[PDB]
Subunit: 334 residues, 4 copies
């Protein structure tokens, strides 16, 4: 069993904790680090607006939180430099605060005693970026020590894009992600550096930028320069879809697009990318463990222009992709 | 004054009523026909979850509703063959029931005394389909008698597509509309012919089909065969955006796409199509009177592939387009 | 195994189906009757906006639905006189259509071969109405044949009211329930017999009436004449709270009110009524199996006037109460 | 015309501005003070998620915002001490930041050159607190210089309570306000000093405390000690109802309760308190200018226990009550 630390016990952090509890047999979260008091953290762990109640007893004191009788050490450094991950024999830290997406900052955890850092976001200066199922075979146990698991949207787009680009080739593509609102947005109209994200999230369609389509190039260099996109944030609390419109030189039909996905979506890669012909709506992919759920009912073709749609639970889907990556790191040389 | 009748006093029927109150100097609604009772009709007219309170006194009795002193005669024939439009001198009927979009059925209003029918929706077997500002000059006041005002989505897409096709030529295009939930969706999971629209509308992203991308070809025949799309229904009560991605042979930038819309978005056409550089979200286009509000901020270009996005108030924008069309009709012949 | 039939495979029907899968070792649903087609029925069973995906394979044909290998025969008689419950050895019918809450009609299931009917709602002319944990010991397996499980709100209010009336005596009480929107409300402003439930449910606070406060008197006759109330429907898809304000002759504090609930909320009764000191919001009681979750944090006292508040999942909590009741019935006679 | 300053150009501030534009013939907002840049403020003024677009042209530069051609000076002191209200001949400042509800702080505006301060919230240390229509006749032009307009909920409850207590007498009462979510709440589950307000506001019924019922005693001292309550925040963006259950010694019916309200709700007091028999839902009282809209359809009576319900637009209703107060202050000795 490899012992894991979380820095940042927020949505993604608490998601990751639950995912380990629900899904892993060989990782154990033994310590976490957060600014806030333990009563607050343990309350948010116990009760979740999206995931429901944790199915286990939660206790806390000032040093720790105990879940189903397993004691978690909780620290509260704003500066990872002050941590001691080595005290708990922690091999992997999940960096999920959002204030260490720069790897030059994040590697403080290595200094502070960890052997690996996985940043739960697009990163700068990292050793490598992965989308599990797409380019994880290029993981280098020796040289890849501070990595990124990319973004939720990238974990949706990249798998679908790989299959279609491998089978037909993508010349150019433009994405709209119709996306659940997220914590960066406001509840009521209020100042924000992005004047659209300033507007009441739960009553508005809110357009906003995203790097997620250009970031595909990080895990699929053959697509560099070829994809771009934006997001429409809408009033659901989780659950998103990525709508990609692309040109191919191939001559293709709705049927051949769909068969390529169904063909690819099997075995291990089938845990990242699913193929569906069901009458899906967003609540049906809430708590879905795939990074990308391809909706074959939505595929359109006009000449050499193709529109495909994949779903993702931007919280849980992403988290399960990150946990898959974490299992790889844990299964190899530390 | 030209006298107007409305058949089907629902979202669009009551939108249209209010638009006439607010926006028209020469039309008057004098009769309405609807299946339900006048207590209900007048409560829903007075109080509206989207448009708010009518600014007028509303009273009812057994066969009329009176709005700001003006008596509106109210009928309740489920079959329009039983209506007497001539008894009130109704020139134009707005057919907004959703059940008479076949013009072969809708013509029952003409037999019933009306001179013109405008179907508030995509129609079949109609004389003509219009998107005001796009092809209304082809309106033939002799031969165009039962006409369609097309769909909300088409009244968004077409003004935009016309301009850009005129300027750069569109080879192929695929559309997604991110659309407010509509009254045919279910509040709780419940049977529907469309097993996705069966799902609780206010907590789901709900994919559905739309004809709008094809139906553009009725009003811009140059685009027949070139557009397809679908809709995503999302939890806002009104307001929608049309996202079109397309190919051109021209060499284009964001700047050149945006400049073409801006140069076109003026005079009378500018009341159909707006050009905006504002930081818009859906609530900002609620109760906007344009059919299409082009968001210059969302234009993207990759190679010869363009993404453009236009907003519309699928209720009030559509209604204001339909009223433009009605005003045109009411400004010409009206024989027989 | 006792064999169960469900008449009306809607929110409650499918809740009940799932509760039996999840929670019962001795009941089995073997037949269901519903007006709509099996493609729809099985899609709505498999995928649920509230409960999520059924954890089982679902297949259908023209007269059955098969769930995890187990074939469920499906009928579609709008009139229960046409059903043959005996053909499948159904002992107990769950009547969850909403259209047969008159026991004089509901008894049509008994004639059709069933030995017992449980109406998932307030009923008329019924043998007996129960809130499990409150008065189910008065269940008479000879003479209680068509029975009601009362309303979601009553299954929240009664366990609480019993305890406090037993301990301090309730003189008078008025209730407000802040309640999730339900399937009979309209998504968009649209005709409804109740002109407030006509209004778009997901963007309004909608006042409506409820019998729950009076109907408590069926199961706690000591409270007849003493309670009234109304509901506020609010934009959450499930989860509700009952806010009761009442007078006692006892001298009470917050501490003493709360201690009475806590001492009562144990053993079997504790699975009906929970006592909580947690910082609860509605999403925390979604899929809670209790009929009533007393929130100790919301208790207020002024003079001899007490305010108490209890949460309930108007879908799953009610269903789990109804299943408790069904298990009781299935544990006794079942003649004829 | 009396010239007005706003400190805090937030929801309530921008509401107040609009209200002056829409409703007053003798007040002019000539200056405002806020931390944020003018592009951001002018964007939020122009476009509102609840009130819709301002019906006038809005321009800005670094010193000002111009609305329909009228230039508003905009400052950006976090410390009112640094303002100069006297430069613009500003007589009344509306204190709507939320960081000067202590009058000992708020009177900095008097030092900084104003003659009157109206705090748009429950206040401490104020000269007086008013609910317009209830106790505004006790306003003292000479000695009441830093005042409070109370809370939205108090502006709903107090008028109804006065009429019922005057006509029947209230011994004791307990309130539930079913209230729109507000900007103090979170969009996604996140730390908050109130662990219920920590939870995703637009998918939850959220119980929370309020002083609004005890504060009635400030404007109706006869009710001191007699009322208390709490709030249930629900997923609407504005619009609220106050549900008051009370004991009276009188013997009373639904009909006599309702007739007392209808009797009182006339003339000037009728602009604060309305009487309605319509089939109201919350969207029907959005943008309603009354402080309290009594719903006679909801009145219940059991023995000597009474339940009444009044609606309020917690933003606009409150603001129009505050504007009424401001007109009183402006109409008297400065
Ligand atoms: N849809 C999603 O929620 C989503 C999807 C993909 C990626 N992500 C990414 O995951 C990351 C985390 O996002 P989130 O939604 O969980 O955020 P969050 O705000 O919910 O969680 C942040 C947590 O970090 C803690 N924290 C902040 N600074 C700290 C510090 N210096 N030291 C220790 N603890 C600190 C806070 O107390 C809080 O508990 C972000 O980079 C985000 O982009 C989120
Ligand atoms: N976003 C939109 O809401 C939108 C946009 C564009 C077009 N439309 C179209 O407008 C039309 C009307 O839709 P709506 O949204 O107002 O629907 P609605 O259901 O809100 O209104 C329908 C009205 O018709 C009445 N009615 C039904 N059958 C009738 C009959 N046989 N005779 C008389 N009255 C009858 C009903 O009582 C009701 O008042 C439809 O064709 C719809 O597609 C709607
Ligand atoms: N919160 C709740 O949803 C709630 C709580 C307590 C009690 N109930 C009660 O449960 C009952 C069912 O309500 P629901 O919410 O499941 O409603 P629903 O409308 O979701 O389900 C009704 C089902 O009955 C079917 N049906 C209708 N008429 C029929 C007929 N004549 N024969 C056969 N099938 C028929 C419909 O096709 C549908 O599948 C009602 O009495 C309701 O008051 C509901
Ligand atoms: N439902 C309601 O919205 C409601 C109802 C009744 C009362 N109120 C009260 O009104 C007050 C304001 O609330 P709001 O909802 O408008 O808040 P808000 O957060 O929307 O507005 C606050 C504004 O103040 C500005 N600001 C903050 N500190 C400042 C400083 N030191 N100097 C200058 N500007 C500063 C901010 O930039 C922001 O623009 C609060 O006391 C609130 O309780 C609100
Ligand atoms: Cs901590
Ligand atoms: Cs003609
Ligand atoms: Cs029997
Ligand atoms: Cs400023």
């Amino acid at each position: 069993t490899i012992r894991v630390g979380i820095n940042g016990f927020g949505r993604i952090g608490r998601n990751f904790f639950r995912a380990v509890l629900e899904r892993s047999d060989d990782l154990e979260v033994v310590a976490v680090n957060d600014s806030k008091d333990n009563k607050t953290l343990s309350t948010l762990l116990k009760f979740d607006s999206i995931m429901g109640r944790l199915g286990q007893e939660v206790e806390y004191d000032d040093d720790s939180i105990t879940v189903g009788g397993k004691r978690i050490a909780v620290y509260a450094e704003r500066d990872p430099k002050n941590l001691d991950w080595a005290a708990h024999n922690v091999d992997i830290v999940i960096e999920s605060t959002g204030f260490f997406t720069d790897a030059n900052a994040a590697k403080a955890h290595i200094e502070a005693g960890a052997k690996k850092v996985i940043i739960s976001a697009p990163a700068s200066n990292e050793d490598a970026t992965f989308v599990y199922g797409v380019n994880h075979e290029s993981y280098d146990p020796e040289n890849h020590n501070v990595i990124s698991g990319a973004s939720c949207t990238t974990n949706c787009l990249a798998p679908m894009a790989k299959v279609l680009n491998d089978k037909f080739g993508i010349e150019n593509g433009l994405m709209t992600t119709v996306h659940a609102y997220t914590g960066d947005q406001r509840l009521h109209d209020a100042p924000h550096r992005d004047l659209r994200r300033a507007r009441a999230a739960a009553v508005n369609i809110v357009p906003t930028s995203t790097g997620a389509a250009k970031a595909v190039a990080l895990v699929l260099p053959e697509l560099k320069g070829k994809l771009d996109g934006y997001a429409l944030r809408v009033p659901v609390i989780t659950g998103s879809a990525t709508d990609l419109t692309f040109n191919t030189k191939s001559e293709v039909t709705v049927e051949s697009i769909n068969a390529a996905i169904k063909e690819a979506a099997v075995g291990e890669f089938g845990e990242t990318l699913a193929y569906s012909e069901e009458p899906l709506v967003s609540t049906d992919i809430v708590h879905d463990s795939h990074g990308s759920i391809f909706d074959a009912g939505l595929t359109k073709v006009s000449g050499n222009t193709v529109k495909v749609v994949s779903w993702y639970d931007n919280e849980w889907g992403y988290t399960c992709q990150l946990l898959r990556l974490t299992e790889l790191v844990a299964s190899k040389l530390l």
